[PDB]
Amino acid sequence: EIRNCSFNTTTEIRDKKQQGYALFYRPDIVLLKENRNNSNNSEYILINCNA
Amino acid sequence: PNNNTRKSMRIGPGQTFYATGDIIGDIRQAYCNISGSKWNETLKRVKEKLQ
Amino acid sequence: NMWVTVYYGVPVWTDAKTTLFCASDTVHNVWATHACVPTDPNPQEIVLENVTENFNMWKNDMVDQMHEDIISLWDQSLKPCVKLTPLCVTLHCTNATFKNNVTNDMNKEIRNCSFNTTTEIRDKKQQGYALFYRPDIVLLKENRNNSNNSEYILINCNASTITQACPKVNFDPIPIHYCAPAGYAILKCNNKTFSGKGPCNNVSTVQCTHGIKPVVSTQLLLNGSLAEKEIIIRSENLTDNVKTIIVHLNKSVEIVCTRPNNNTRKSMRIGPGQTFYATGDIIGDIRQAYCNISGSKWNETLKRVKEKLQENYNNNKTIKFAPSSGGDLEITTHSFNCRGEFFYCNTTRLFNNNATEDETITLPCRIKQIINMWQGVGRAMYAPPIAGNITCKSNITGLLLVRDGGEDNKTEEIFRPGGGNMKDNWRSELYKYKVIELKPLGIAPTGCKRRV
Amino acid sequence: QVQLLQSGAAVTKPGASVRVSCEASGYNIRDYFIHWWRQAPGQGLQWVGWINPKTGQPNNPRQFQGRVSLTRHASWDFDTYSFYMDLKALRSDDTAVYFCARQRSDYWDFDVWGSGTQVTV
Amino acid sequence: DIQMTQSPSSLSASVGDTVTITCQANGYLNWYQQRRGKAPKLLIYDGSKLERGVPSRFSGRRWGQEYNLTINNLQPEDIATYFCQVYEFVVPGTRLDL
Amino acid sequence: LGFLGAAGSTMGAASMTLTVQARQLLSTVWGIKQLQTRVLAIERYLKDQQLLGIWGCSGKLICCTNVPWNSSWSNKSQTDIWNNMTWMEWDREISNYTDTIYRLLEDSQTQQEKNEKDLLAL
Amino acid sequence: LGFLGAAGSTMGAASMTLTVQARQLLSTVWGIKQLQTRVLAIERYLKDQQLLGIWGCSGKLICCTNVPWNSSWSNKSQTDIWNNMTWMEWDREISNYTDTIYRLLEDSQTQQEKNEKDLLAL
Amino acid sequence: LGFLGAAGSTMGAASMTLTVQARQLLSTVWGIKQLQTRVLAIERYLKDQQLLGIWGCSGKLICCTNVPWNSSWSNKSQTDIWNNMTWMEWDREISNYTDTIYRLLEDSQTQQEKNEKDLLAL
Ligand SMILES: *[C@@H]1O[C@H](CO)[C@@H](O[C@@H]2O[C@H](CO)[C@@H](O[C@@H]3O[C@H](CO[C@H]4O[C@H](CO[C@H]5O[C@H](CO)[C@@H](O)[C@H](O)[C@@H]5O)[C@@H](O)[C@H](O[C@H]5O[C@H](CO)[C@@H](O)[C@H](O)[C@@H]5O)[C@@H]4O)[C@@H](O)[C@H](O[C@H]4O[C@H](CO)[C@@H](O)[C@H](O)[C@@H]4O[C@H]4O[C@H](CO)[C@@H](O)[C@H](O)[C@@H]4O[C@H]4O[C@H](CO)[C@@H](O)[C@H](O)[C@@H]4O)[C@@H]3O)[C@H](O)[C@H]2NC(C)=O)[C@H](O)[C@H]1NC(C)=O
Ligand SMILES: *[C@@H]1O[C@H](CO)[C@@H](O[C@@H]2O[C@H](CO)[C@@H](O[C@@H]3O[C@H](CO[C@H]4O[C@H](CO[C@H]5O[C@H](CO)[C@@H](O)[C@H](O)[C@@H]5O)[C@@H](O)[C@H](O[C@H]5O[C@H](CO)[C@@H](O)[C@H](O)[C@@H]5O)[C@@H]4O)[C@@H](O)[C@H](O[C@H]4O[C@H](CO)[C@@H](O)[C@H](O)[C@@H]4O)[C@@H]3O)[C@H](O)[C@H]2NC(C)=O)[C@H](O)[C@H]1NC(C)=O
Ligand SMILES: *[C@@H]1O[C@H](CO[C@@H]2O[C@@H](C)[C@@H](O)[C@@H](O)[C@@H]2O)[C@@H](O[C@@H]2O[C@H](CO)[C@@H](O[C@@H]3O[C@H](CO)[C@@H](O)[C@H](O)[C@@H]3O)[C@H](O)[C@H]2NC(C)=O)[C@H](O)[C@H]1NC(C)=O
Ligand SMILES: *[C@@H]1O[C@H](CO)[C@@H](O[C@@H]2O[C@H](CO)[C@@H](O)[C@H](O)[C@H]2NC(C)=O)[C@H](O)[C@H]1NC(C)=O
Ligand SMILES: *[C@@H]1O[C@H](CO)[C@@H](O[C@@H]2O[C@H](CO)[C@@H](O)[C@H](O)[C@H]2NC(C)=O)[C@H](O)[C@H]1NC(C)=O
Ligand SMILES: *[C@@H]1O[C@H](CO)[C@@H](O[C@@H]2O[C@H](CO)[C@@H](O)[C@H](O)[C@H]2NC(C)=O)[C@H](O)[C@H]1NC(C)=O
Ligand SMILES: *[C@@H]1O[C@H](CO)[C@@H](O[C@@H]2O[C@H](CO)[C@@H](O)[C@H](O)[C@H]2NC(C)=O)[C@H](O)[C@H]1NC(C)=O
Ligand SMILES: *[C@@H]1O[C@H](CO)[C@@H](O[C@@H]2O[C@H](CO)[C@@H](O)[C@H](O)[C@H]2NC(C)=O)[C@H](O)[C@H]1NC(C)=O
Ligand SMILES: *[C@@H]1O[C@H](CO)[C@@H](O[C@@H]2O[C@H](CO)[C@@H](O)[C@H](O)[C@H]2NC(C)=O)[C@H](O)[C@H]1NC(C)=O
Ligand SMILES: *[C@@H]1O[C@H](CO)[C@@H](O[C@@H]2O[C@H](CO)[C@@H](O)[C@H](O)[C@H]2NC(C)=O)[C@H](O)[C@H]1NC(C)=O
Ligand SMILES: *[C@@H]1O[C@H](CO)[C@@H](O)[C@H](O)[C@H]1NC(C)=O
Ligand SMILES: *[C@@H]1O[C@H](CO)[C@@H](O)[C@H](O)[C@H]1NC(C)=O
Ligand SMILES: *[C@@H]1O[C@H](CO)[C@@H](O)[C@H](O)[C@H]1NC(C)=O
Ligand SMILES: *[C@@H]1O[C@H](CO)[C@@H](O)[C@H](O)[C@H]1NC(C)=O
Ligand SMILES: *[C@@H]1O[C@H](CO)[C@@H](O)[C@H](O)[C@H]1NC(C)=O
Ligand SMILES: *[C@@H]1O[C@H](CO)[C@@H](O)[C@H](O)[C@H]1NC(C)=O
Ligand SMILES: *[C@@H]1O[C@H](CO)[C@@H](O)[C@H](O)[C@H]1NC(C)=O
Ligand SMILES: *[C@@H]1O[C@H](CO)[C@@H](O)[C@H](O)[C@H]1NC(C)=O
Ligand SMILES: *[C@@H]1O[C@H](CO)[C@@H](O)[C@H](O)[C@H]1NC(C)=O
Ligand SMILES: *[C@@H]1O[C@H](CO)[C@@H](O)[C@H](O)[C@H]1NC(C)=O
Ligand SMILES: *[C@@H]1O[C@H](CO)[C@@H](O)[C@H](O)[C@H]1NC(C)=O
Ligand SMILES: *[C@@H]1O[C@H](CO)[C@@H](O)[C@H](O)[C@H]1NC(C)=O
Ligand SMILES: *[C@@H]1O[C@H](CO)[C@@H](O)[C@H](O)[C@H]1NC(C)=O
Ligand SMILES: *[C@@H]1O[C@H](CO)[C@@H](O)[C@H](O)[C@H]1NC(C)=O
């Protein structure tokens, strides 16, 4: 149920990125492009953030 | 019942995001507690009035 | 016998709080014509004989209404203007290089900042540059291997959004008149020596007031009006050391301020119709900005202020001035607004009690472009440059003084420049009047009986 | 809930500048003046000064001019403020407990006081 | 300037006694309870108003320039020095014994 | 004299300017505020007109109400009230009876118009 | 009794509380809705006052209209109407004649004031 | 005939339709504009009613004002005015005296109601 999601997002400057992480509950995570060679590289998004 | 220690990550110029950082202690499911006898009496009375 | 008789239209009133209309005389200046109605032509003032009315300047509501309206209007006046969010990027700021006699003091103030920003197409970048004043640049990650690779940003662009002022906004403090709504009227005190709080015994009724210039300044009051008869000191309890002392002068002192540099402007496009203005280069030499205050007029003014302050306290006390105790730049120095340029002038040569023989006192000034005017509240504004040198002149008509604490075993009282609370400046004009609510329905006994 | 937290005691030598901090939280800080007081052992409370949390203007009495610098640093979103008293020309006569307090009224009524920072010289 | 006096320099009473402490000043006064501890606690503000959280034992009255700080039903918890203030001026208080 | 005019004059003299004060009761976000102001002014005017109507004084500035004056409200001669007092002083003098008298006025109109007049139309 | 009060009482008794109901007719997006509400309440009040004015009943709660009652509208004794009916029942009883009677009332005022009174002032 | 009706008819004939015109005075950004419109219509109605009230003509469409007609305002017979002119022509004919006459009307009401009537109630 509790997933450790790592992601690259913005910071308070237009030209820099941050690598961070957060714990999310499974119902809020949607799977994309499951990686069958190394399951730790599967892609996920926040539920309905694409809609 | 969990502590769910919070982490705060900045996204932009005054735009901040809050998410669970880590958890101190063990992890249990959330739950609700309803008194057994009060519920049983309530349903008995509801059944009588519906009938 | 006696009977009750009802009279409608009785000239009585009570104290009340309401909303006043703005009016002004006839590019759209912030405030004024864009959202105001015509003024009352040929307005009348009706003297109320044998009427005494208690006016408190400090508790007047009109001050809060004026404060709110000015803040709201300013924010709207900036709402449609170009935002500088795409410029909150890494800057490389080095010493600006000029070919003509730049003083060693200015080499540390004007920085040549190179940066990579957007253009009017989503897939392309521009490498550009601009000259900025040191107070607007914040250092990040200083490079100790090659100091020219240190990173800089615009001040506070990481905290909020900086919005460039639209070049078509008129920042002249055009006087705005306040008109009472129907059912309400404004009472004015015509007692030339009124302290600002108390039972004024010479009052008149005004349907709509005269105009007040929304001038923004600190430490000294500019423009506005002069006292009719004498210098007046207004200060709430007077003995309470956290209450401002407002000195209303009966004679003005002329002050001339200038930015002598040409500051040739460059215009760089950021996006689809979003343009940014910044100083390109400077033709000629570089000098500090400054203000010129006549020496003898200032010396006379301070002599008279000291005499009137002494009259309001124990006679066994010397009145002296001292430099400002410090704090934010907006209150440490005197704040101006001359054609959009915000000056922060060092006034320690005026309040040091040094009777300097100089015919003209000259005060160095700093100019800053990223201004958060309302004590940190509101959007940060970027003031674009104007090519050519700028001169301006204004009248100093009052002072904001703060008492230097207090103790025993002391034979002198020290006053320092204060201010920073815009409401006090607005009070220095609104103190003359208050708003009343008409209560026209009254009853009284007489011999009037119905025939019925 | 109005809260004022203070730093712990500091011990130094004459001439060494000392900083005493007070952190305000849990209320709208910008609406009230913050005052500093000095309580020497066995004595009453001496007034040290006031600071306006919105403009930063200090006001100190004659005996502390040129020696005490009062400042403030606002935190993000103005939820808390850190106030500081920097005493420069420190002497052995300045051993005292330094308190911060909120002025909530026009009578100089101080409702909430900090714990007090002991300075020994 | 604001002049002040304070009397007595010290007070000694029994438990349950009603006592007064006199302070004179030409200005707004307040009163504080100073303990050998973290901070003084404000007791009285304005001419005669009590703060929230103050037990209903402390009271006061003014006549001319004098204030009495009447303390009814004095309890062991009330051993403290009572300070009197006008703006920036704080006058050393009366040390109460019990 | 204009609005309010002789505000400090005696109660008698001030009765000759009742129309002067009576005519002054009627006449993007800022527009909303002004609107709100106009609506409140209209409501106050209508409340005063409705109150005068209930008392049976509609359309008049001076009206007899057929209610005796009580000695508990005031005890002054007509000369003292009309020549030795202003309207502000009188308004303060009987402020605490403002609503009591109004109730009696409503009752007077209740007694008249229906109970004392409907029986005569018959 | 308060607003509406004896709503279920007879037509006669209810006539003594007409002022109680009469006084209850007057007093960011949400503010706009409230405004709209105030304006509609004002318009309804003014329409009722204008209608009473046209009928010649301005400033009164009870007025004679000098229009004979038609037997086609109702056929009840005064006792039955005033002591044996409520105002709701009466309102339903003659609902379909509400506008017809109003026209006659306007015509009555048209016949009076000018045609029957202007010739006498001469 | 409806609103305005016989606009081109003589002044006499047009007096019989005064109620027809009188009834037509009362009844997201677009809503704000409509509101503003409603408020202005209400203000104009109230100003006209207040002016009629001040003149002592409240609740009436026809009223005598007890003010003599001056030969400097017009010099026409009653037949010429009422049978040989329309209201538009008359309105133009005396336009420049519109405010002067109004002042006299206010003074007439000032002379009446108080000065000529209060002394009789005594
Ligand atoms: C207390 O009160 C005192 C008394 O009022 C205050 O002090 C006064 O404050 C006012 C208001 O700022 C000053 O008025 C301005 O004066 C300047 C000076 O004008 C001289 O030069 C003009 C030529 O301009 C050219 O040279 C200048 C540099 O020399 C250069 O900057 C400019 O771009 C251009 O290249 C002459 O025309 C002018 O003569 C005229 O005025 C004389 C006044 O005395 C008069 O005697 C003459 O007969 C003649 O009528 C004079 O020699 C003016 O330049 C400035 O003009 C602005 O405002 C007016 C008013 O509407 C407007 O018509 C102008 O077009 C101009 O407005 C531009 O800037 C606005 C900024 O808000 C902007 O909103 C406009 O849309 C417009 O923008 C255009 O230009 C900019 C600039 O590049 C561009 O970026 C835009 O895209 C657009 O193209 C004012 O008239 C007083 O001089 C000053 N002193 C006195 C004694 O009155 C004091 O400030 C108060 N206290 C406080 C604290 O404020
Ligand atoms: C700056 O701040 C200071 C405070 O820090 C402020 O001082 C106040 O200012 C007001 C206005 O001037 C003062 O009011 C005056 O006080 C004079 C003396 O004190 C009076 O009030 C005492 C309080 O008693 C209570 O009970 C009385 C009724 O008994 C009631 O009125 C009070 O409101 C209160 O409830 C009272 O004890 C005292 O009586 C003593 O003194 C008199 C005088 O010797 C003596 O006869 C008595 O026997 C007794 O010993 C007195 O009543 C007072 O003289 C003065 O009276 C004049 O004005 C009133 C009307 O206002 C007239 O009726 C009277 O005849 C006089 O003409 C007035 O009442 C107030 O006391 C100060 N407050 C404090 C805390 O000091 C400054 O004004 C501020 N300055 C600025 C610029 O803002
Ligand atoms: C916007 O940024 C400024 C500083 O600017 C730059 O960006 C920041 C995100 C950091 O990466 C900075 O390193 C960088 O220069 C922020 O103000 C800065 O805050 C820091 C603390 O967070 C200050 O550092 C410390 O301050 C204490 C004060 O007691 C010193 O004792 C320390 O030795 C150290 O200096 C730093 O000085 C300060 N900078 C300025 C110019 O005041 C600002 O908070 C930030 N805005 C937001 C909303 O985060
Ligand atoms: C909800 O009910 C459960 C019972 O199943 C509670 O769990 C008990 O909690 C007590 C302490 O509060 C323990 O001593 C027991 O051993 C627990 N028993 C079980 C089966 O878990 C639980 O605490 C209740 N929660 C609340 C909030 O009332
Ligand atoms: C500010 O810095 C810029 C960047 O170096 C200077 O512009 C450069 O000037 C050199 C020499 O003329 C040119 O070779 C570069 O191509 C210029 N760069 C750009 C982006 O145009 C500019 O002259 C400096 N201004 C001052 C006043 O020192
Ligand atoms: C803007 O972009 C230019 C081009 O990429 C950057 O110039 C490079 O800077 C690095 C050091 O950071 C050098 O090693 C490269 O050789 C430079 N490129 C060229 C073509 O000279 C410049 O640093 C960027 N500036 C910012 C603030 O991002
Ligand atoms: C009270 O205030 C009025 C102002 O409303 C004063 O009347 C003015 O007097 C000056 C000097 O004679 C005239 O120039 C003004 O025209 C007058 N104003 C009006 C509206 O007539 C009056 O003198 C003041 N009285 C006192 C005693 O100060
Ligand atoms: C302004 O108001 C003050 C206060 O009423 C007037 O000063 C008073 O003047 C009278 C003489 O007429 C003295 O008896 C009072 O003692 C004075 N009181 C104070 C507090 O000074 C002053 O005269 C008024 N100004 C004008 C021009 O009339
Ligand atoms: C402000 O005052 C200074 C005086 O210090 C003026 O500087 C003088 O300017 C004149 C020409 O206007 C020169 O001939 C003098 O040699 C200058 N003297 C000094 C000491 O600089 C300055 O011009 C004044 N500025 C304004 C705007 O009036
Ligand atoms: C305003 O200018 C004065 C000097 O005119 C500054 O005070 C002194 O400046 C000299 C250098 O010119 C220093 O050597 C002194 O140490 C300064 N005095 C103090 C007490 O530090 C003053 O600091 C300036 N103020 C601002 C805000 O810039
Ligand atoms: C800028 O000027 C200073 C002189 O104050 C000098 O020390 C510094 O090295 C200069 N910076 C560059 C990049 O040349
Ligand atoms: C200003 O007031 C002073 C009194 O403090 C007086 O001496 C001086 O002449 C006045 N000046 C003017 C221009 O009225
Ligand atoms: C300033 O005025 C004082 C009198 O108060 C005088 O002694 C001094 O010489 C004057 N100084 C100048 C420069 O005018
Ligand atoms: C530079 O200053 C000169 C006057 O010394 C002026 O003639 C010229 O137009 C100015 N140029 C700019 C771009 O401001
Ligand atoms: C500076 O401004 C003044 C007046 O605006 C002007 O006379 C003078 O020529 C200007 N100097 C330069 C170098 O632009
Ligand atoms: C300063 O005051 C004088 C005298 O009233 C006036 O002539 C001058 O125009 C004023 N200056 C300004 C900038 O308003
Ligand atoms: C305080 O108590 C003493 C006891 O005699 C009394 O004389 C004095 O008037 C009192 N003062 C007040 C202000 O109550
Ligand atoms: C004010 O009082 C005097 C007293 O003589 C009187 O003559 C004057 O008319 C009064 N004021 C008014 C407006 O009536
Ligand atoms: C006057 O009022 C008092 C108190 O309300 C009342 O007792 C008394 O009867 C009233 N007088 C008359 C004549 O009604
Ligand atoms: C309801 O009907 C009963 C019938 O006896 C009557 O007594 C009562 O008064 C009526 N209610 C009202 C409010 O009149
Ligand atoms: C009553 O109404 C009917 C129908 O409208 C009509 O025929 C009859 O004449 C009316 N009665 C009178 C007396 O007018
Ligand atoms: C009104 O007309 C409807 C038919 O449209 C009828 O059902 C109803 O009973 C009528 N009511 C009266 C009071 O005439
Ligand atoms: C228009 O004039 C003619 C002239 O004969 C008249 O008969 C007709 O009635 C007039 N129109 C109206 C509406 O009165
Ligand atoms: C008619 O008006 C004129 C001018 O206003 C005036 O002179 C004349 O006296 C007036 N006639 C009467 C009878 O008042």
Residue numbers in the entry:
A (entry chain C): 153 to 185, 185A, 185B, 185C, 185D, 185E, 186 to 198
B (entry chain C): 299 to 309, 312 to 323, 323A, 324 to 350
C (entry chain A): 33 to 58, 65 to 143, 150 to 185, 185A, 185B, 185C, 185D, 185E, ...
D (entry chain H): 1 to 52, 52A, 53 to 71, 71A, 71B, 71C, 71D, 72 to 82, ...
E (entry chain L): 1 to 27, 32 to 91, 96 to 106
F (entry chain B), G (entry chain E), H (entry chain F): 520 to 546, 569 to 663
Provide the publication's sentences verbatim:
Then we interpreted the glycan effects in their oligomeric-protein context through a novel cryo-EM structure of the CZA92.012 SOSIP.664 trimer in complex with 3BNC117. Overall, the Env-trimer structure resembles that of previously published ones: the Cα root-mean-square deviation (r.m.s.d.) from BG505 SOSIP.664, also in complex with only 3BNC117, is 1.1 Å. The V4 loop, shorter than in other Env trimers that have been structurally analyzed, is fully resolved, suggesting a more stable antigenic surface, while the aforementioned region around D411 is exposed and flanked by the N332, N339, N386, and N407 glycans. The exposure of the autologous epitope in the glycan defect around D411 explains its high immunogenicity. A comparison of the CZA97.012 SOSIP.664+3BNC117 structure with that of the BG505 SOSIP.664+3BNC117 complex and with that of the BG505 SOSIP.664+3BNC117+PGT145 complex demonstrated that the PGT145 epitope was conformationally intact on the CZA97.012 trimer: PGT145-interacting Env residues in BG505 Env are mostly identical in CZA97.012 Env, and the opening at the apex – measured as pairwise Cα distances of R166 across protomers – is essentially the same across the 3 structures (maximum difference of 0.5 Å). But cryo-EM of 3BNC117 in complex with PGT151-purified CZA97.012 SOSIP.664 showed only closed trimer, demonstrating that PGT151 purification does not irreversibly open the trimer. The closed CZA97.012 trimer (in the context of bound 3BNC117) presents a similar gp41 topology to that of 35O22-bound BG505. Density for the first two GlcNAc residues of the N160 glycan is visible in the cryo-EM map, suggesting that PGT151 purification is not selecting for glycan underoccupancy at this key PGT145 site. Taken together, the observations of a closed conformation and of full glycan occupancy at N160 of PGT151-purified trimer suggest that differences in binding and neutralization after trimer purification or PV depletion with PGT145 and PGT151 therefore most likely stem from the other glycosylation heterogeneities at the respective epitopes that we describe above. Only in the log-log plot could a tendency towards a PF plateau above 50 μg/ml of bNAb be discerned.
As model for study, we chose Env of the genotype CZA97.012, belonging to Clade C, the globally most widespread subtype of HIV-1, which is particularly prevalent in Africa and Asia. The clone CZA97.012, also known as 97ZA.012, was isolated from peripheral blood mononuclear cells of a 29-year-old female in South Africa and is classified as relatively neutralization-resistant, i.e., of Tier-2. Native-like, soluble CZA97.012 trimer of the SOSIP design can be affinity-purified by bNAbs to quaternary-structural epitopes, including PGT151 to an FP-interface epitope and PGT145 to an apical epitope; purification with the latter, however, results in low yields. Neutralizing antibodies (NAbs) to multiple epitopes on the HIV-1-envelope glycoprotein (Env) have been isolated from infected persons.
